[PDB]
Amino acid sequence: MSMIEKLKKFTQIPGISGYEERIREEIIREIKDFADYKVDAIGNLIVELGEGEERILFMAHMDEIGLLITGITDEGKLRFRKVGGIDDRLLYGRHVNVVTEKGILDGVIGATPPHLKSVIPWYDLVIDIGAESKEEALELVKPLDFAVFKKHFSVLNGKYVSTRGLDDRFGVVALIEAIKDLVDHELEGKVIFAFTVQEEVGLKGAKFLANHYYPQYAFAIDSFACCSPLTGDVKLGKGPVIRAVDNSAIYSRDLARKVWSIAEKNGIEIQIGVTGGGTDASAFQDRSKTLALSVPIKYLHSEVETLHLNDLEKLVKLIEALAFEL
Amino acid sequence: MSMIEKLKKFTQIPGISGYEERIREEIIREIKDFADYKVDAIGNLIVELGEGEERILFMAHMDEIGLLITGITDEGKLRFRKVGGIDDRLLYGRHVNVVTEKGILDGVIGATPPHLKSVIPWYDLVIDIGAESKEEALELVKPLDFAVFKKHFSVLNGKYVSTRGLDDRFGVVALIEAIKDLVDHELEGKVIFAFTVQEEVGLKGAKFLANHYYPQYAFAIDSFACCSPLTGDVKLGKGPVIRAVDNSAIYSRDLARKVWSIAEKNGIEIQIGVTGGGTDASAFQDRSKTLALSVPIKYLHSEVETLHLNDLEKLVKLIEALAFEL
Amino acid sequence: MSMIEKLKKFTQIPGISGYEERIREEIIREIKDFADYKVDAIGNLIVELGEGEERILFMAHMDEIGLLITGITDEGKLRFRKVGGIDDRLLYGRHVNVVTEKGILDGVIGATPPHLKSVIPWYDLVIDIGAESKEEALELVKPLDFAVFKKHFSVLNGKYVSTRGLDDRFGVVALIEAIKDLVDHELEGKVIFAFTVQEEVGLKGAKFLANHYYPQYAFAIDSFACCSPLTGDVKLGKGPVIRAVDNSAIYSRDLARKVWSIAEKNGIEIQIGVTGGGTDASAFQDRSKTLALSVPIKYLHSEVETLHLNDLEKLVKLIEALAFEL
Ligand SMILES: [Co+2]
Ligand SMILES: [Co+2]
Ligand SMILES: [Co+2]
Ligand SMILES: [Co+2]
Ligand SMILES: [Co+2]
Ligand SMILES: [Co+2]
């Protein structure tokens, strides 16, 4: 499986914050023959390599943003709440997959035709699943089931991938790759790989992880929103990015410098910049030197979020070198 | 060296959140002869006096609000983001010091003359450093360098001092004065003095400190914004003020009573009130009894922030008395 | 005795329109040993070179913009009026020097902290001098005293100077320089150098001068606001500018041609353009060929107004050539 193929597979699995089971399972499926692993009370998936002192923690989150079903209407439609940050403009006139205990169902968030001028807020929207009444709907879906967008998967001009969930399924893919490449090597102290839950709603998996683990270095592998005047000269295609500062943290300048040095040593093109949002790494600013490492991502938090495949390839190289040299 | 001159010394040194090096080095220079010290992995400077159980922690922060260089424009101007809370109205038509590895350079944030109505927001502003191109500017300044206002220092009518950085360099100076005066005295158990980092961006230095110290009483020494209908009868010149409640916390009422009692027994005039903001002390409200002790400061977070020298004198006396009697 | 040091010395002297004493006194000190001079009834300082017909007049103004103390509040703050054009945005949160008959006092125009959106109008502002009451304040300052901003002085990348008062203290320095460089030479007719008063409040000094002098050519040496769509391709560093049209006049075109020609004749780089504002030259449009000669200035009428040292270097050579050849 090429990288394109891995990104397609992991982005297609539905799993919002608190509902990460299907992604965890699949990570288990392809790590199990390589490494042992455990699962948290909150649902984090942790893989430890090496032995001794906890030297490095790498975190990529399994949750994507989406919709939580809050109730069913008399007309048999689904009311919902947003989970994570979503622009209301992106909810209107969209197919969704409704994920229930029994299986997965097509749903549709409607639009009103010109035949029959403002942004419709999420609380005025519902999901149509083709039920004719509340009773018919409660047979298919229950409150606290969830929904995520149906996901087109695109490759732009051979170099870019666009699809909902790159954030942070690219991070999941990257850590899996790193795990396979590293299991057979001998490593100084422990290097910990953690696939976290509930990142999109306040870094909940990460904070849980922060009791239980006390790494010298704690890294989040996550998106870097690009591009605008805030993001300086960070560009898609110019390499992985040190996320030095975001809204959640000024990260360790000591650690950024080491990463930058290790990348140059290895001939790995690398970028550094400032952006918006937070990462799991900020949950460890408490105890460890922390940093976030990313690929830059365009149109973040939409169906068309886009990354450059070369940045990702380089990110995997960088993560492995850090495991060796940091 | 008068208090005036000690205040000016420490306020003139540049160090925003995450970039506190220059302040820490100077504090060490001043405290080196008198006591041992340790530096945190996040950069807190810690000084223990005495032996036994951790009775009292005093925190004062080293970081000041300022600007983080995010990028360079095509014409060699510096783009930036704010660090800590700054009213955009205060950015327009100002001199800055841009701080880089290779040293400190002059900079200017321009203003548009009438010759050529509203507040210009931070993201539309740039710093002029006299570069003619992006290339020439990069030789001088890099992204993730920082800038801080040039600082006039004024003495109003003998008794008030006005300059940027009084918050919280007044507290830095207060604690240094307390260390010097208490080091040659037996008082047990342990009295801990911390000069914290990253207070202005969510008390990060203190939250890290909280994982390594567990004092009975945790104090922040910081500003008390004054005056308005929120701040009751607090006045500059009426003495140190107990910061009993702010936006970050309702502090320990029993701790405030003891402090009140110790002040009155030592004949120290003292005040108590409500104001806005948070302090380092709130990072300990999950484990210690907390309080913030302040001098009242007018025009907080600007180049003309003002304190009354006599309140500062008395705060120093109050802090020593607490060391002995709390 | 660098140019930069002269600019600093002359910019730092306080003197608004009508209150130019301190500046005039310092110019007198500097030329005392070189030429005779007269002071007229409004305050202009005039230096005559040569004998005969009044050929050339050069005017540069001594007054700067600033604040006039109008009264003292109950709580002992200073109310004020603006003198000359100042954007209200530049008054908020600033240090000032209050100039009294007794001496110079520190002062501050406050800013309200977030802890306790629009431009605050001048009439809603006051200066804080640390008086506790009207009584104490009136002992320190009286109505009809004045105030100017405290002035940072910056050099940008070695070639730009920035500080309040380059307008028109650069012109004052330029004319002093020329007077020293011409006194030991024989000119045709008279060349008259005048340091005017009250330029910033409607050219009152120059209007007074115009009833006592009738030059063939009348020159203002003053700033040229730059840069915008109005100013064409005028740029700092590209040499002295012929201010050919502003809001106060369409200046003498044939005089512009002559200057242009004497400039090229001397290999002196030079610019011409349109800008806003008025100059002292406009007061002579009544009776003489008039022109205004400048260096381009950025951020005019602020603390960060900026000129290029080479432009100033060349302007001085141009003035001297005009004295020889015009
Ligand atoms: Co993410
Ligand atoms: Co996200
Ligand atoms: Co503050
Ligand atoms: Co503070
Ligand atoms: Co002017
Ligand atoms: Co002028």
Short mmCIF file of C-alpha atoms in Angstrom, two decimals, chain B:
data_model
loop_
_atom_site.label_atom_id
_atom_site.label_comp_id
_atom_site.label_asym_id
_atom_site.label_seq_id
_atom_site.Cartn_x
_atom_site.Cartn_y
_atom_site.Cartn_z
CA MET B 1 20.96 51.71 44.26
CA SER B 2 17.57 53.29 45.04
CA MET B 3 14.30 51.44 44.43
CA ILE B 4 13.77 53.75 41.43
CA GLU B 5 16.98 52.49 39.86
CA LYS B 6 16.37 48.84 40.71
CA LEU B 7 12.94 49.14 39.09
CA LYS B 8 14.35 50.80 35.98
CA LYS B 9 17.13 48.22 35.68
CA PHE B 10 14.77 45.23 35.65
CA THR B 11 12.04 46.88 33.54
CA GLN B 12 14.52 47.85 30.80
CA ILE B 13 15.41 44.21 30.10
CA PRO B 14 13.48 42.56 27.23
CA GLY B 15 11.85 39.18 27.73
CA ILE B 16 8.39 38.19 26.60
CA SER B 17 6.64 34.95 27.48
CA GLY B 18 8.81 31.96 26.56
CA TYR B 19 11.79 34.28 26.02
CA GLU B 20 12.73 35.15 29.59
CA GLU B 21 16.52 34.44 29.35
CA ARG B 22 17.76 37.98 29.89
CA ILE B 23 15.66 38.59 33.00
CA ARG B 24 16.59 35.24 34.60
CA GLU B 25 20.33 35.86 33.98
CA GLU B 26 20.11 39.25 35.63
CA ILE B 27 18.17 37.91 38.59
CA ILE B 28 20.83 35.22 39.08
CA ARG B 29 23.54 37.89 38.90
CA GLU B 30 21.73 39.73 41.70
CA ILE B 31 21.01 36.69 43.87
CA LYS B 32 24.11 34.55 43.20
CA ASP B 33 26.07 35.88 46.20
CA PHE B 34 23.21 35.36 48.64
CA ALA B 35 21.71 31.97 47.98
CA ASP B 36 21.60 28.83 45.87
CA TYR B 37 19.20 28.54 42.94
CA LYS B 38 17.89 26.07 40.38
CA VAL B 39 16.48 26.43 36.87
CA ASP B 40 13.41 24.46 35.73
CA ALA B 41 13.19 22.72 32.37
CA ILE B 42 10.57 25.34 31.43
CA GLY B 43 12.83 28.13 32.75
CA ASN B 44 11.49 28.99 36.20
CA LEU B 45 14.21 30.27 38.54
CA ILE B 46 13.78 28.81 42.01
CA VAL B 47 15.36 29.83 45.31
CA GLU B 48 14.79 27.83 48.52
CA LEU B 49 15.40 29.25 51.98
CA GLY B 50 15.41 27.06 55.08
CA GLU B 51 14.70 23.36 55.59
CA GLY B 52 11.78 21.04 56.27
CA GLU B 53 8.22 21.20 55.01
CA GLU B 54 7.29 23.62 52.24
CA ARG B 55 5.55 26.37 54.18
CA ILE B 56 5.37 29.32 51.78
CA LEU B 57 5.84 29.76 48.03
CA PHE B 58 6.17 33.27 46.58
CA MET B 59 5.85 33.65 42.77
CA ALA B 60 6.58 36.71 40.61
CA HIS B 61 6.75 36.46 36.84
CA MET B 62 9.67 37.41 34.60
CA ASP B 63 7.79 37.62 31.31
CA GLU B 64 6.26 40.83 29.94
CA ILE B 65 3.69 41.17 27.15
CA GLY B 66 5.04 41.85 23.68
CA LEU B 67 5.32 40.90 20.01
CA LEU B 68 6.41 37.69 18.26
CA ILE B 69 7.83 38.04 14.74
CA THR B 70 5.83 35.68 12.53
CA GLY B 71 7.16 36.53 9.06
CA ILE B 72 8.91 38.98 6.75
CA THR B 73 7.14 40.91 4.02
CA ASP B 74 8.26 41.31 0.42
CA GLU B 75 9.44 44.83 1.31
CA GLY B 76 11.39 43.61 4.34
CA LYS B 77 8.92 44.63 7.03
CA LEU B 78 8.27 42.37 10.01
CA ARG B 79 4.85 40.85 10.50
CA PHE B 80 3.96 39.86 14.07
CA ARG B 81 1.45 38.34 16.45
CA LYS B 82 0.79 39.61 20.01
CA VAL B 83 1.99 37.78 23.12
CA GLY B 84 -0.11 38.39 26.20
CA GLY B 85 -2.92 40.93 26.33
CA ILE B 86 -2.27 44.21 24.49
CA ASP B 87 -4.81 46.78 23.38
CA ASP B 88 -4.25 47.33 19.63
CA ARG B 89 -4.64 51.05 20.27
CA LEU B 90 -1.23 50.90 21.96
CA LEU B 91 0.67 49.46 18.96
CA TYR B 92 0.23 52.31 16.53
CA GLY B 93 3.06 54.84 15.98
CA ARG B 94 5.55 53.28 18.44
CA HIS B 95 9.29 52.55 18.69
CA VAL B 96 10.31 48.94 19.38
CA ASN B 97 13.35 46.89 20.24
CA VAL B 98 13.49 43.79 18.06
CA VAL B 99 15.43 41.11 19.94
CA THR B 100 17.43 38.61 17.87
CA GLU B 101 20.23 36.11 18.47
CA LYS B 102 22.83 38.50 17.03
CA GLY B 103 21.58 41.25 19.37
CA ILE B 104 19.02 44.05 19.64
CA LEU B 105 17.87 46.27 16.73
CA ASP B 106 15.71 49.43 16.52
CA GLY B 107 12.28 49.11 14.96
CA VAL B 108 9.24 51.27 14.31
CA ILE B 109 5.53 50.60 13.95
CA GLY B 110 4.38 53.43 11.70
CA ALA B 111 1.45 55.85 11.65
CA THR B 112 -0.29 57.36 8.59
CA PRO B 113 -0.16 61.18 8.56
CA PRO B 114 -3.19 63.39 7.79
CA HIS B 115 -1.13 64.77 4.89
CA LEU B 116 -1.59 61.47 2.97
CA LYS B 117 -10.91 57.41 12.28
CA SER B 118 -10.55 53.89 13.69
CA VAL B 119 -8.24 51.58 15.61
CA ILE B 120 -5.95 49.68 13.33
CA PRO B 121 -5.99 46.02 14.34
CA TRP B 122 -2.77 44.16 15.12
CA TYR B 123 -2.77 41.98 11.97
CA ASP B 124 -2.73 45.04 9.66
CA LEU B 125 0.38 46.44 11.40
CA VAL B 126 4.07 45.82 10.63
CA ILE B 127 7.48 46.69 12.12
CA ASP B 128 9.85 48.83 10.00
CA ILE B 129 13.52 48.00 10.65
CA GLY B 130 15.04 49.98 7.78
CA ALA B 131 15.37 46.97 5.47
CA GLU B 132 14.69 47.47 1.75
CA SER B 133 13.91 43.86 0.84
CA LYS B 134 12.84 40.55 2.33
CA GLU B 135 16.41 39.34 1.75
CA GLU B 136 18.03 42.19 3.63
CA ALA B 137 15.56 41.80 6.51
CA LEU B 138 16.24 38.06 6.92
CA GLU B 139 19.94 38.83 7.42
CA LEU B 140 18.89 40.92 10.41
CA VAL B 141 15.78 39.31 11.87
CA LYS B 142 14.22 35.86 11.79
CA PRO B 143 10.71 34.55 12.35
CA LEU B 144 10.32 33.69 16.08
CA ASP B 145 12.49 36.55 17.16
CA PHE B 146 10.50 38.99 19.33
CA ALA B 147 9.94 42.66 19.93
CA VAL B 148 9.05 44.84 22.89
CA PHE B 149 8.26 48.57 23.19
CA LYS B 150 11.05 51.02 23.78
CA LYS B 151 10.53 52.17 27.33
CA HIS B 152 10.37 55.70 28.70
CA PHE B 153 10.74 55.72 32.48
CA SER B 154 8.98 58.52 34.38
CA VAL B 155 8.82 59.56 37.98
CA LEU B 156 5.66 61.44 38.76
CA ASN B 157 5.98 64.07 41.50
CA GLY B 158 8.54 62.14 43.53
CA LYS B 159 6.41 59.16 44.46
CA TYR B 160 5.01 57.38 41.40
CA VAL B 161 6.95 55.40 38.83
CA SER B 162 5.71 54.88 35.27
CA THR B 163 7.14 52.44 32.74
CA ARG B 164 6.22 49.22 30.82
CA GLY B 165 7.14 46.09 32.73
CA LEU B 166 6.41 47.24 36.27
CA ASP B 167 4.10 44.27 35.84
CA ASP B 168 5.73 42.13 36.98
CA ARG B 169 9.31 43.41 37.38
CA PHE B 170 8.16 45.26 40.53
CA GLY B 171 7.43 41.81 41.94
CA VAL B 172 10.78 40.50 40.76
CA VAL B 173 12.56 43.28 42.62
CA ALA B 174 10.35 42.76 45.69
CA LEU B 175 11.27 39.08 45.96
CA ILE B 176 14.98 39.72 45.40
CA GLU B 177 14.83 42.28 48.22
CA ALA B 178 13.11 39.70 50.43
CA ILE B 179 15.72 37.01 49.71
CA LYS B 180 18.61 39.35 50.56
CA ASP B 181 16.93 40.31 53.84
CA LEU B 182 15.87 36.84 54.99
CA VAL B 183 18.85 34.73 53.96
CA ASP B 184 20.73 35.51 57.19
CA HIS B 185 17.79 34.51 59.41
CA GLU B 186 16.55 31.26 60.86
CA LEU B 187 12.93 30.66 59.95
CA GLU B 188 11.59 27.23 59.22
CA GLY B 189 10.43 25.26 57.49
CA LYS B 190 11.00 26.08 53.81
CA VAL B 191 10.28 29.45 52.18
CA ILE B 192 10.47 29.17 48.40
CA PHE B 193 10.96 32.05 45.97
CA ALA B 194 10.10 31.41 42.34
CA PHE B 195 10.63 33.76 39.41
CA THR B 196 8.15 32.28 36.96
CA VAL B 197 7.92 32.08 33.17
CA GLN B 198 4.96 32.49 30.84
CA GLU B 199 2.54 33.98 33.32
CA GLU B 200 1.10 36.26 30.60
CA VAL B 201 0.05 33.32 28.41
CA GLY B 202 -1.87 31.21 30.88
CA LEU B 203 0.41 30.78 33.89
CA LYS B 204 2.47 28.05 32.20
CA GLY B 205 5.56 28.51 34.40
CA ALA B 206 3.46 28.19 37.56
CA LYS B 207 1.53 25.14 36.37
CA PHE B 208 4.86 23.42 35.75
CA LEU B 209 6.17 24.58 39.14
CA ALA B 210 3.03 23.12 40.73
CA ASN B 211 4.14 19.63 39.74
CA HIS B 212 7.36 19.97 41.73
CA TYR B 213 6.29 21.94 44.84
CA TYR B 214 3.49 21.38 47.33
CA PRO B 215 3.49 24.33 49.73
CA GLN B 216 1.02 24.98 52.52
CA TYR B 217 0.61 28.57 51.28
CA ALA B 218 1.14 29.78 47.69
CA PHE B 219 1.36 33.50 46.99
CA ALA B 220 1.58 35.42 43.76
CA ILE B 221 3.22 38.82 43.88
CA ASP B 222 1.71 40.71 40.96
CA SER B 223 -0.26 43.76 39.76
CA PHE B 224 -3.66 44.83 40.98
CA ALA B 225 -5.34 46.82 38.19
CA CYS B 226 -6.79 50.03 39.59
CA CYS B 227 -8.95 51.98 39.65
CA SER B 228 -12.64 51.74 38.66
CA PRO B 229 -16.04 51.00 40.20
CA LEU B 230 -14.94 47.33 40.31
CA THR B 231 -11.98 48.10 42.60
CA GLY B 232 -13.93 49.75 45.44
CA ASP B 233 -11.79 51.99 47.61
CA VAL B 234 -8.36 50.71 46.58
CA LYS B 235 -6.07 53.67 45.96
CA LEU B 236 -2.44 54.00 44.99
CA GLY B 237 -0.50 55.18 48.05
CA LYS B 238 -2.70 53.38 50.58
CA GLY B 239 -0.43 50.37 50.72
CA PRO B 240 -0.07 46.77 49.48
CA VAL B 241 -3.37 45.24 48.47
CA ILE B 242 -4.65 41.75 49.02
CA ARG B 243 -5.95 40.60 45.66
CA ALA B 244 -8.81 38.59 47.15
CA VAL B 245 -10.72 37.81 43.97
CA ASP B 246 -10.09 38.15 40.26
CA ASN B 247 -11.19 36.44 37.02
CA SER B 248 -8.97 33.42 37.62
CA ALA B 249 -9.93 32.74 41.26
CA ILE B 250 -11.68 33.41 44.53
CA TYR B 251 -8.57 32.99 46.69
CA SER B 252 -8.33 31.61 50.28
CA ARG B 253 -10.27 33.83 52.66
CA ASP B 254 -8.52 32.36 55.71
CA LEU B 255 -5.13 33.06 54.15
CA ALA B 256 -6.26 36.63 53.53
CA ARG B 257 -7.30 36.95 57.21
CA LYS B 258 -3.91 35.75 58.45
CA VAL B 259 -2.15 38.17 56.12
CA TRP B 260 -4.50 40.95 57.19
CA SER B 261 -3.72 40.11 60.84
CA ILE B 262 0.03 39.92 60.31
CA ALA B 263 -0.04 43.28 58.49
CA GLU B 264 -1.96 45.03 61.26
CA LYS B 265 0.24 43.54 63.97
CA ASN B 266 3.30 44.91 62.14
CA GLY B 267 1.68 48.32 61.63
CA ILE B 268 1.65 47.89 57.84
CA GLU B 269 -1.19 49.72 56.08
CA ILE B 270 -2.89 47.31 53.76
CA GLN B 271 -5.91 47.11 51.46
CA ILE B 272 -8.11 44.41 50.01
CA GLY B 273 -10.17 44.34 46.84
CA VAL B 274 -11.51 42.73 43.66
CA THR B 275 -9.92 43.24 40.21
CA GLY B 276 -9.61 41.59 36.80
CA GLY B 277 -7.18 39.08 35.37
CA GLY B 278 -5.45 36.02 36.77
CA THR B 279 -2.24 35.26 38.68
CA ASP B 280 0.27 32.40 39.16
CA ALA B 281 -1.33 31.67 42.54
CA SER B 282 -4.35 30.16 40.79
CA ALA B 283 -2.18 27.36 39.39
CA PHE B 284 -1.95 26.14 43.01
CA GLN B 285 -5.60 26.39 44.00
CA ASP B 286 -5.93 22.65 43.45
CA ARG B 287 -3.33 21.84 46.16
CA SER B 288 -2.46 24.80 48.39
CA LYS B 289 -4.14 27.73 50.05
CA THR B 290 -3.67 30.60 47.59
CA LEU B 291 -3.58 34.39 47.60
CA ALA B 292 -2.21 37.18 45.40
CA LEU B 293 -0.48 40.16 47.02
CA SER B 294 -0.03 43.29 44.98
CA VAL B 295 0.61 46.92 44.67
CA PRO B 296 -2.19 48.84 42.91
CA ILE B 297 -1.16 49.75 39.33
CA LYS B 298 -2.82 52.29 37.03
CA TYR B 299 -2.84 52.07 33.22
CA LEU B 300 -1.84 48.41 33.42
CA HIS B 301 -0.36 46.77 30.28
CA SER B 302 0.83 49.96 28.67
CA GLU B 303 3.97 52.07 28.47
CA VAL B 304 2.65 54.34 31.22
CA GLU B 305 1.67 51.79 33.89
CA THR B 306 2.15 53.42 37.25
CA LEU B 307 2.88 52.36 40.83
CA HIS B 308 3.38 54.30 44.08
CA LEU B 309 6.83 53.69 45.58
CA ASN B 310 5.56 53.64 49.13
CA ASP B 311 3.19 50.73 48.39
CA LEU B 312 6.23 48.86 47.09
CA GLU B 313 8.26 49.53 50.25
CA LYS B 314 5.42 48.21 52.39
CA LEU B 315 4.88 45.15 50.22
CA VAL B 316 8.53 44.22 50.77
CA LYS B 317 8.02 44.59 54.57
CA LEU B 318 4.81 42.57 54.38
CA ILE B 319 6.50 39.72 52.49
CA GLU B 320 9.30 39.45 55.08
CA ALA B 321 6.79 39.54 57.96
CA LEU B 322 4.90 36.69 56.32
CA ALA B 323 8.11 34.68 56.05
CA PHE B 324 8.62 35.04 59.79
CA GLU B 325 5.06 34.79 61.12
CA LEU B 326 2.72 33.00 58.68
#
